Design a protein around this ligand. Structure first.
Ligand SMILES: C[C@@H]1Cc2c([nH]c3ccccc23)[C@@H](c2c(F)cc(NC3CN(CCCF)C3)cc2F)N1CC(F)(F)CO
Ligand SMILES: CC1=C(c2cccc(O)c2)[C@H](c2ccc(I)cc2)Oc2ccc(O)cc21
Lengths: 225, 234
């Protein structure tokens, strides 16, 4: 079914599964800032699982594989969401509508400034590319399906065919927007290369969270069913 | 001078710029303890590093960049570049990493350094994913140049805008070069877009492998510095 969808259908279904925008509870210094960001992360996580179950192909996977994809992707997903929300607040991060934070407020946590700077830089790149909400939902799905695909064979083929239809979906949006074939191939490549930076940011994030002192498999295991 | 090149001229130059395959020190005490194996691999990577600078200066667009921006891209890319280099030459050796023609190691020799085996298994999966897709040399040299230009572009006044848009124009030129190679080979436009996307999604795991590698190199306890790379650049 999910392999037999048009560009239009894939977009619609993803536009439909989008979690809602959440609110914080808001000086700071290490403890509270982390507090507010931790809690909001944890609430966003709950909505993430129900969003993933609505990504075409995802539910056709085993619960083992669903869980692994999520334990590898969860912080890339949070981060592309933040970056997407921040696109029209140049030089700030819209954590929540009541928590819009400055490059300068990263200094309130040791090691966080660097992760704000990365994030702000991805936001500006989205703004300059005029990233569309339809392109956003496709990329957030690419991340979900792609960040642990390389780790049975039947499952790998299914994920790779889903990702083929999201490529088609991404190309269709750009053709409908009226881009040339050269402009289409180019914009496809620009958006998928930003995923390597988001992967980078995820890994430096994870690293910085272990300086703080991450969900296990059992965590997500229970939450899917 | 990189925006003048046709697809074929961009491929020609990238093939021509390729570093040679180096050997590991010949007849070290066999078998290895963790230390001596880490000495062999470090000795080899540090030698590969010198050739990588020479290779980097022949990637079209790279010498148009300031020396500061040139070293920033190498700071950010060097381990992803060594790693894609490893997975390509490892392709035709299922379950084996061809570090050198004289240093061919399977998963189990990876266990001889604590933490190395996880990163080993990732490098092995990636080489298999390359085999599975029948990655071509012309494509490989396009991916290796994309890592150099892309990895550090996101962490750069009018100056460094023209550097960031120039890097992006070059990257757009390498994308076109990849499509041309696929269209030339007889792939449909659809298959052309699909194969471009799967090649670029693999760059995201290579970044992952790179950050895990750097994590592991730190754990053990050194890596290229800024100044060092500045020196080799000139
Ligand atoms: C700035 C980034 C990105 C980010 C954080 N909060 C968010 C809320 C909504 C959307 C995005 C974010 C925040 C963030 C986060 F992303 C997760 C957590 N930790 C909690 C995730 N929890 C799950 C396990 C609970 F037991 C631990 C704390 C944060 F400050 N994060 C920091 C970092 F992870 F990159 C480390 O520097
Ligand atoms: C990927 C890789 C290493 C590797 C393997 C596993 C983990 C890791 O962190 C690095 C290891 C290495 C050792 C020391 C340094 I300084 C850099 C790389 O030795 C190499 C040699 C050549 C090469 O092309 C790639 C590697």
């Amino acid at each position: 079914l999910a392999l037999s969808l048009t560009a239009d259908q894939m977009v619609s279904a993803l536009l439909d599964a989008e979690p809602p925008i959440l609110y914080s509870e808001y000086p700071f210094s290490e403890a509270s800032m982390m507090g507010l960001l931790t809690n909001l992360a944890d609430r966003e996580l709950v909505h993430m699982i129900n969003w993933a179950k609505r990504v075409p192909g995802f539910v056709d996977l085993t619960s083992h594989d669903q869980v692994h994809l999520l334990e590898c992707a969860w912080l890339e997903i949070l981060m592309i969401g933040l970056v997407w929300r921040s696109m029209e607040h140049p030089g700030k991060l819209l954590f929540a509508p009541n928590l819009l934070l400055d490059r300068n407020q990263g200094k309130c946590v040791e090691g966080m400034v660097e992760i704000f700077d990365m994030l702000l830089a991805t936001s500006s790149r989205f703004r300059m590319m005029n990233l569309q909400g339809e392109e956003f939902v496709c990329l957030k799905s690419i991340i979900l399906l792609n960040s642990g695909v390389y780790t049975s064979l039947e499952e790998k083929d299914h994920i790779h065919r889903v990702l083929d239809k999201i490529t088609d979906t991404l190309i269709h949006l750009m053709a409908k927007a009226g881009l040339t074939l050269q402009q289409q191939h180019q914009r496809l490549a620009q958006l998928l290369l930003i995923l390597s930076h988001i992967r980078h940011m995820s890994n430096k994030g994870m690293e910085h969270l272990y300086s703080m002192k991450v969900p296990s498999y059992d965590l997500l295991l229970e939450m899917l069913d």
